[PDB]
Amino acid sequence: EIRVKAIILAAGLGTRLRPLTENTPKALVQVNQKPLIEYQIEFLKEKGINDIIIIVGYLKEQFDYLKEKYGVRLVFNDKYADYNNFYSLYLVKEELANSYVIDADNYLFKNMFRNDLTRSTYFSVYREDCTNEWFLVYGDDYKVQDIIVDSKAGRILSGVSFWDAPTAEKIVSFIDKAYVSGEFVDLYWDNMVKDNIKELDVYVEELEGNSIYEIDSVQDYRKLEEILK
């Protein structure tokens, strides 16, 4: 599917961002007076990636205006509160090939996106004092050998990744299998690269520390606002 596209995961409750997400979906929380997802969508379109699919769920009606504003497609995930985000990707599994997968609760300081990527890539920032993050194990060729959870510092899965057709095909088969084997409700879509890493060819694109800014709490949000001034 040589049509580079993008999938934005914005269906979750974003409970950890309280009070920001009490009446606003996290993808629409405003930083510098602009919904977070708009910064991402604009970066994408600036690069010609105009086939954008947004997975919505919690307070989905607030996303409607984006269809006429940017030409994005919205996909409703009614299990946004029941299942983990493996299901968000399941709903658009056939769109994975040559697609970016983006977390909607990150502020991108730099435009990372390109329409000429030829291999599956994890755009990773280095972090310390980590909590519940997943890390990338790799050598000189930047090829991911494993993805682990046992660390407080390192190159983490940061919320921006790209998947080529051959890789996406393998992942869809893993997705199909998990969905029909009664072992998926609590899984993250990432479990499918992590739990089958030995069968996939994925590479790491080392990002400068301030390329992606994670908003994991209202405190993170307040600090970013101060930075954006």
The CATH number assigned to the domain holding 84 equals 3.90.550.10
Q: H helices then E strands: how many in the chain?
A: 6, 15
Residues ending a continuous segment of the chain before a break (C–N > 2.5 Å)? none
**Whose CA is closest to 74, among 88, 53, 92?**
53
Resolution value in angstroms: 1.5
Burial class for 74, CB neighbours closer than 10 Å (0-12, 13-18, 19+): middle
Q: Is 2 helix (H, G, I), strand (E, B) or coil?
A: coil
The closest alpha carbon to 59, from 10, 95, 105, belongs to: 10
Domain assignment of residue 201, given as a range: 1-229
Experimental method: X-ray
Q: What string of DSSP letters covers 137-200?
A: EE-TT-BEEEEE---SSEEB--SEEEE-HHHHHHHHHHHHHHHTTT--TT--TTHHHHTTGGG-
Residue 42's closest CA among 61, 21, 66? 66
Q: Is 46 helix (H, G, I), strand (E, B) or coil?
A: helix
Question: Quick check: 197 and 145 in contact, CB under 8 A?
Answer: yes
Q: How many domains does the chain have?
A: 1
- Alpha helix ranges (H) inside the chain: 36-46, 65-70, 86-90, 165-179, 191-194, 218-228
